[PDB]
Amino acid sequence: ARPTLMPRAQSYKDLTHLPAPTGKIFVSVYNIQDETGQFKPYPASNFSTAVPQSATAMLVTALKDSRWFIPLERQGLQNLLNERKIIRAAQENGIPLQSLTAANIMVEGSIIGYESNVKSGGVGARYFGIGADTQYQLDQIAVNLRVVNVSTGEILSSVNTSKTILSYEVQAGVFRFIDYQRLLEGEVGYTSNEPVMLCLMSAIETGVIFLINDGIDRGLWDLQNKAERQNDILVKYRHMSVPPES
Amino acid sequence: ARPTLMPRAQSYKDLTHLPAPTGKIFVSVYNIQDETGQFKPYPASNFSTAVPQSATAMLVTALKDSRWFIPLERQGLQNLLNERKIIRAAQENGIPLQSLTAANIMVEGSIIGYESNVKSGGVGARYFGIGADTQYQLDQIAVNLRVVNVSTGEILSSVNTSKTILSYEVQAGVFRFIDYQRLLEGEVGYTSNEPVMLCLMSAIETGVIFLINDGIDRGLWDLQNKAERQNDILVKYRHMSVPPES
Amino acid sequence: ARPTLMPRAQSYKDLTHLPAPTGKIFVSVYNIQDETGQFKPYPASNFSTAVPQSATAMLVTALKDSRWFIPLERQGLQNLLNERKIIRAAQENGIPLQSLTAANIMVEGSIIGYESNVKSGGVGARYFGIGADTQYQLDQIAVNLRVVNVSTGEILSSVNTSKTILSYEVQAGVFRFIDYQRLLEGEVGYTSNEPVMLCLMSAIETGVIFLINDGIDRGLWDLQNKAERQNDILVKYRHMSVPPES
Amino acid sequence: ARPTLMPRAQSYKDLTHLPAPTGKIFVSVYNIQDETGQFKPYPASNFSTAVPQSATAMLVTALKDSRWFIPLERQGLQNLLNERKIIRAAQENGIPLQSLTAANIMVEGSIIGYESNVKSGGVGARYFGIGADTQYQLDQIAVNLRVVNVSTGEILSSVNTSKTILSYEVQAGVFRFIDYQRLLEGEVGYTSNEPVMLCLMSAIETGVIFLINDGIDRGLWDLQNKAERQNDILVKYRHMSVPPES
Amino acid sequence: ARPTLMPRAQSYKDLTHLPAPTGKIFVSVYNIQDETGQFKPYPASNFSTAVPQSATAMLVTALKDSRWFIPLERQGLQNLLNERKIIRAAQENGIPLQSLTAANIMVEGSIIGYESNVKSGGVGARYFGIGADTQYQLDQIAVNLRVVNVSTGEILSSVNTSKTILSYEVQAGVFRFIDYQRLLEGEVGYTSNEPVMLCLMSAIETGVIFLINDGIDRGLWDLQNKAERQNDILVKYRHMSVPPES
Amino acid sequence: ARPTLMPRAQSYKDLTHLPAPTGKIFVSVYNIQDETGQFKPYPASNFSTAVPQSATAMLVTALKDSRWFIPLERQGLQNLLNERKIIRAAQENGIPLQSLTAANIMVEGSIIGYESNVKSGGVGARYFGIGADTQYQLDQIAVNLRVVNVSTGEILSSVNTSKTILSYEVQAGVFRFIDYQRLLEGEVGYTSNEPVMLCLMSAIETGVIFLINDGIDRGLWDLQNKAERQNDILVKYRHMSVPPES
Amino acid sequence: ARPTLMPRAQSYKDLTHLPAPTGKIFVSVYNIQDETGQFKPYPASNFSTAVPQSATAMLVTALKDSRWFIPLERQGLQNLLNERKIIRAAQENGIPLQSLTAANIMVEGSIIGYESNVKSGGVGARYFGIGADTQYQLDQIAVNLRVVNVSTGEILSSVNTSKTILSYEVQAGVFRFIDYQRLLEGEVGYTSNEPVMLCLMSAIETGVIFLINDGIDRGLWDLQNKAERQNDILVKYRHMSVPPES
Amino acid sequence: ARPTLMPRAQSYKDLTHLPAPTGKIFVSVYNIQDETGQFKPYPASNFSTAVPQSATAMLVTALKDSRWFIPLERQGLQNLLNERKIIRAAQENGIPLQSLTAANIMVEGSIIGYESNVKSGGVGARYFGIGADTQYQLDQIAVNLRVVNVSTGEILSSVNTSKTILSYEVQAGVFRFIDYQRLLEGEVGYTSNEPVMLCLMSAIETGVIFLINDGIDRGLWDLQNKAERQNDILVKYRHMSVPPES
Amino acid sequence: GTMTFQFRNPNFGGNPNNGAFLLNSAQAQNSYKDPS
Amino acid sequence: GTMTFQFRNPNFGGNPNNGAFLLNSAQAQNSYKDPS
């Protein structure tokens, strides 16, 4: 096909239309570790991880496009410090650069577990020759995000989100004897694996709005206008603040 | 589906409605090690661990939402100390930050073993063509949590909790000869693996309430009101203080 | 089901009702190494250990609930020393902490071997269509515990305990021809693996009482009252002081 | 066949005809990490990565041929610094070289996940002997690119792109009995795997134009002529600035 | 069943009733290395060692219960020295401990080889339907122990012991046709693997008595009474002092 | 069975009855490396070595019981030096030990190769139902030992020995039809693998006598009496001084 | 059987009867590396090397028994230097040793490749029931040896030798029907793998005589008598000085 | 068979009869790396390299026997420098050695790739019972050698050579029914793998003559007599100086 | 452990080795004769 | 997990072990006699 932007869920359109704050908040995003410890089963490789190791690149895109935070490069800090030695070596030899911008808070977190085959199922039916069947699985991924006050070392707010990755498959088939000593045959199949790459981005973009909403109730950072406290987006994520039961 | 919060058991609603203490207690949560040493069997990978390595991110969410403890960032301490060098380098060049908040106690612990296939079973039945069957397994996970007084190095209280992870499967089936030289066929199946990701969170959130309850009987920390000593939650976890037999 | 405490054998109720000593004895529990060197066979993973690596977390729970010892944090000593640097850095900047409590003895030990399939067996029987069978295995685990006088470096007492882990399986079955050209079928099965997680805790909790009993006969530490020397618990573990034969 | 240049998509002809800026912008491209963590399944090797590790060599070719950036060697910096020790050793012994050119911005990024078998399918049909079938899979790759201001450490713009890698297969076949006791047979097959090597280059060359376009709207760097703001290329990538839905 | 002491062979009752010496001899037991280099075959894991790595914990129990030696902690010396830094840090801040007790001799050694399937065998018999069979294997383990004079570095005495680990299996079976068109079936089986964990302890406890007996003939250490030189135990291990032939 | 000494070949009785020298010769035995590089084939583990790694513990037993050499602890020298720091620390605090005894020569060597299946064979025979067969293999192990003068660094004498490890198997069998519609069946089998653990000890104990005999002809060390030069043992190993042909 | 010396080829009897030189030449033999890089195929282990790693112990035996060279311990030099620290520590405390003997030349080399299945073959024949067959393989090993003048660093002489390792197998068999409804059966087999352990020793012992012969023609070292230049051994290895063709 | 020299191709007889130069040229041969990265397929081991790692020992034999170069020991330089410390330690204690000879040029290079199964093929034919077949493969190996001027660091000449390794197999067979109810059978087979050990030596010995010939045309080193410029050997390698086409 | 769903029928996605058992256990139980 | 599409027919790309079941379950259901 053609290259385009990464496709986005309802939460990304729900994230962009957030109310604006008074001033933007700097944030250091160091590392979101893949602490699932779960690899892909057969017939994949023994080494391929179930969740991609790039959750820290997805969170920076969530914070930057939210129009609330100004993210700072702390992932490739060792490459950024090696670049600022090269500018400083050319300064003394034939504008002076200022120091690095430092953040008030640092958002860090994990990917707390990935369970595959939480539920399964399947229907099938064959009359005389003609058949059809269905299958589905759904895996569950969970993301932990917490805001750390870097001044004192405390933890301000911590939320857990979740997402269900549905992977179904529909297949038909015909194996009959049409009129004597002739044999008909046909198959039509279709599968659809939802990518865990794209369901991780929709669970992180939702967990950001639970951090921004929890900052307003706890008085951490205030909105630009108090009349926009009753926005339809923030009243939608306040009903989801209680978790589902089990 | 849609992203939401991580689903919570009865213990989380049992944890939030705890009585309030006099003052909040700081706590350092360094590392909860996966000391099970148990990996997933075939047909999963040889490398995938049976229990996720993110138990330390689950305990901080249990302590923070309990409204008793103020957790402190000690997991990513090496990233937090590297951030406070960048602020301090911009302080001398063109508000002074205070030191890190230190804790009175430090909650640490482990995951003491994970045994798979503790019990099993299964029924089956086939009359003329029509069939049905059932299966179930249940695994057992155990969590150790202990409170360490960091002033003297003693151990104040230590509790062990447990949880049973049921994983059943129901399947039907029909393979008959309906009226001469025609063949009917149908299958309906359904499995349900309970996630070990979610049963680890319910065993940790229960083991926190056995630490808070054991602090009140031993005089470690006292409640805000002594009339709330007879709460229905704390009288429920005092009956469970004796272990089951074997 | 519901989360609860870890289920306990007869030895835990036998451990709690011990007589009280004159004063509690501090103890350092550094590391109990899994020196079995035995991994799980097929169809488990090649990497999963047969005995969990968390025996040092189980012994601290045995010593703490015995109401004789005050255990000290020496497992996570490197995390406890890093915490006391953070308090000491905030002391000089804008109560002085005392030093770590040190122990008189240090209980250390191992897990001396785990042999699987020590005994086996099985019965089976089929008459006309109807059948039944049984199987059982029993594995053997052994725990070494020894008390080290830390003043001189000697070894005061050393005991070995053992436990047999029974794992049976009962299965029925019917494959008959009921009245002409109909076919009956039924299966009922049930297995029960005793967890090695829970049989390790019952062998450690028994080996503690053989250390406390051996301290009284050797004059290491004395009871609070000499009339309680003739307790029914201590007279029960004196008959078991001679080992079984082979 | 014959060696030639690497074949290029529509985006490369779309990249070369961009409007010219006022002055060229230096850029350091250190490392684009393969953070997919996904390896190739059977019957390939267990060790072969799904995405090539050479994305940092592809981005430099995209920046250099865009006629906007002057890329700088920062990948083999340790080899370039060892060369400048050899020139400097021959300078003191029997033109003095200037220092390294340093960049204003540094483009860095990742490959955020690679999901294989996102969709599948297949048709088949056999009448009397003569048959035909079809298959197709399509994998999805995603590339993260972000521009880091190296003076302050902020992140200026960050975009995500995506690409679908179609891999189909068409096969015919005949197995008949032509006139008595003779047997005809024929097969014709054809597959076509689109290379992930070449679809990674088309997703990076598209993500560069989303960085150049986002610089003009945010006032980072301005065009040479404001009448060329309404170019047909830049108005084409402004309609694609909103992502697809899911 | 119930936890108990580790079951002991004839040699342990033969070890406890040894004559008493003049004074007890200190001994350092550093490490008994598993130098077999033999792992368990299929269907066990590739990684599980044939002999447990805990022979050094078994020898200390043999020396301590022999009522001749006072063993010293030299295995966990790095943990014992870290404990004595904590006492010494609390000494200068608000009884002085003496130095470590040092030994006259140090008993060290190895496990010299483990050969599996030294001998095998098996009988079988089936008449009309009714059957029975038998199998047996026997493995051979060997233990080296030597006493090192730590003053001069010489080797005082060195002995090799051996043990045969029998593992048999008995199985019956019936597959007949009882009265027309009925089918009887029955199986009864029983195996018994002798543990290599327990046969290593009986080869070490025997090799200790060959060290104590060889000390009396060489004048290394003398008995408390010379009339007890003619004990029935020491005259039993003097007849076994010559090895079997091959 | 019962524990006993390791069974010994003809060479051990041939080694003990050697003539006595003038004075005993000290010897350092550092390490005999398993330089075979040969592991065990299927169905054993991939990791289990064919020859045990404990040849250095077998040579010390050969030198000590030969009544010619006084061996010195140089294998666990790092443990012996750590013990003599503990005595020396208790000397200055509230008999002075002499230095380590040093050797005139140092016996070192290797295990030069282990070839499996050098020869094989097998007979079989079946008449009407009744059968019998035989198999045998023989492996070959070789041991290098050389005496190094530690004063100058020269090599005084070097010998190579060899041993053949026979492993046979005898099996019978009956599968007949005794009187009409009855079926007899019987099997009797027996294998015998000679241990490579025990054939390594008999090749080392022989290679010691070729070192002691070569010392007398070269004038390295002389006998106590020259009339015992014509002993029946030393005249037996002088005929074997020429190697077999090939 | 019985232990004996390692069996020797024609070259060893050809090596011992060499003419005597004027004076013996010291030689350092550091390491002969197994640079084949070839491991054993199935059904052996994946890790077992095709050629043993002990070629450096075989060359020292070739040089020592040649009555021309005096070899020096340079393999275990780190053990020999640790021994001479122990003598020197006892010298200053309550004969002074001279320095190590150093060599004029140092013989070093490699094992240049090992190719398995260079040639193969096999005959078979079956008439009515009675059969017979034959197989053979032959592998090829090559040894490089070169003499290095240690004074200047030059290479004096370098030779390559080779050897063919034949491994045959002969098997018979009978499967007939002797007189009606009786069945005869018999098999007789025999294999013989020549050891690569023993063919490496015969290729090294031959390559030594090509070094000694090349020293006399180049004037490196001269014989004791010039009349012995025309020996039958040295005139035999001068005809083999030209290589075979290919 | 019997040990002999390594068999040599036409190029070795073509190398020895080269014209003589004015003076011999010293050369350092450090390391020829196996940069093929190709291992042997099934049924060999996974670890065995396709090309031996001893190409640096083969090149020194090519340079030494060419009667043009004097090679220097630079492979085992760390062993040669450790030997010259031992001579120098005996010099000061109770002829002074000169420094190492250093080279004008240093020949280094690689093994640029090894492709297996470049071509294949096979014929077969069976009439009534009697059959025959043939197979062949041919692999391709390539060697890079380049002369480095060590004074300035330039590269003087660089050549690539190649060789084709043919491996064929011929097999016959008979499976007939000779006169009624008798069965004849016979097989005759023969394979021949050309060793890659020996084809690497013939590609290196050819690549040396392309270096010596390229030195004379470029004026690097001149012949002893200009009348020998027109030798039949050097005019033969000048026609091969142009490569084959593809 | 994990309970993964699989069809027991080789017509759908399932193991093909119990195809010969599924058909032989169906023709051993049918009682429909040929109508004519 | 991942749902990979595979044909259930050995004529197309599929497992060959259910070929003998696919044909035996088709000839046990056909009702077409020989026309003549």
Author numbering:
A (entry chain H), B (entry chain I), C (entry chain A), D (entry chain G), E (entry chain B), F (entry chain C), ...: 10 to 103, 111 to 262
I (entry chain R), J (entry chain Q): 1 to 36
Question: What did the publication describing this PDB structure actually write?
Answer:
Two soluble accessory factors, CsgE and CsgF, have been thought to bind to CsgG and play a crucial role in substrate (CsgA and CsgB) secretion and curli amyloid fiber formation. To address these questions, we determined the structures of complexes in curli biogenesis system by electron cryo-microscopy (cryoEM), including CsgF and CsgG (CsgFG) complexes both in the free for and bound to the N terminus (residues 1–22) of CsgA (CsgAN22).
The CsgFG complex structure was determined by single-particle cryo-EM at 3.8 Å resolution without any imposed symmetry. CsgG and CsgF were observed to bind together at a 9:9 stoichiometric ratio. In the 2D class averages, the CsgF C-terminal domain (CsgFC, residues 37–119) showed weak densities on the extracellular side of the channel, which reflected high flexibility of this domain in the complex. CsgFN was inserted into the CsgG channel β-barrel to form a layer inside the CsgG channel.
